[PDB]
């Protein structure tokens, strides 16, 4: 399912396609205008075309044409059968180059899918003062989380671990400086430590690297 991007908007889709993509690049994503539907976003002629994907509950189609049991069957059909997809009274639209849904960084401090409870246990057991990692937010899909071990090296303290939301909408923490990359945000906060409301300084001293 490389070409599927779970947590993006139509504007994000355009950005990826225009930045990482070439003509013929495409991806699928959830519909924002019609929750439960899906959307095919395709790059052609330097621009991006969005195409509604109907999800009836029983099948998927493009509001016409062939019907499919799964979203992946639909997408694979149109990739495999050049000429089956076209603009009405328009050109054939080629699904040539899938735009893969990639992690926001390759740094080993990024743990991807990891819950707060799971992050607390890893940092508590394998971290020490100032150990940190970044993970996906489970309660805010598309956002990220900086989880940091605080205070002395003891197992018990309140949790030994603080979690700070990183908005992705470009990346910020709580409406401060906006960064073009997660790596850039982490670099910044390593050098200029954030301070929690209640007064602890969150120094990012060493990563707790994934063993994944």
């Amino acid at each position: 399912r490389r070409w599927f991007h779970p947590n993006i908007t139509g504007v994000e889709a355009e950005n990826l396609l225009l930045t990482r993509g070439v003509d013929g690049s495409f991806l699928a994503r959830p519909s924002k205008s019609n929750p439960g539907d899906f959307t095919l976003s395709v790059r052609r002629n330097g621009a991006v075309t969005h195409i509604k994907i109907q999800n009836t509950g029983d099948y998927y189609d493009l509001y016409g044409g062939e019907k499919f049991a799964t979203l992946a069957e639909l997408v694979q059909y149109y990739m495999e059968h050049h000429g089956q997809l076209k603009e009405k009274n328009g050109d054939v639209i080629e699904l040539k180059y899938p735009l893969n849904c990639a992690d926001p960084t390759s740094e080993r401090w990024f743990h991807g899918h990891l819950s707060g409870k799971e992050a607390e246990k890893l940092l508590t057991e394998k971290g020490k003062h100032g150990s940190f990692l970044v993970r996906e937010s489970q309660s805010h899909p598309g956002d990220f989380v900086l989880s940091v071990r605080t205070g002395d090296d003891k197992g018990e303290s309140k949790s030994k671990v603080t979690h700070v939301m990183i908005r992705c909408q470009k990346y910020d923490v709580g409406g401060g400086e906006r960064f073009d990359s997660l790596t850039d945000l982490v670099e910044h906060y390593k050098k200029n430590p954030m301070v929690e409301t209640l007064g602890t300084v969150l120094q990012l001293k060493q990563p707790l690297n994934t063993t994944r």
């Binding site: 969005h50 509604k52 509001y63 016409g64 997809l85 076209k86 603009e87 009405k88 328009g90």
Partner: peptide
């Protein structure tokens, strides 16, 4: 903006 297709 959505594009109608066949």
């Amino acid at each position: 903006t959505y594009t109608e297709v066949d």
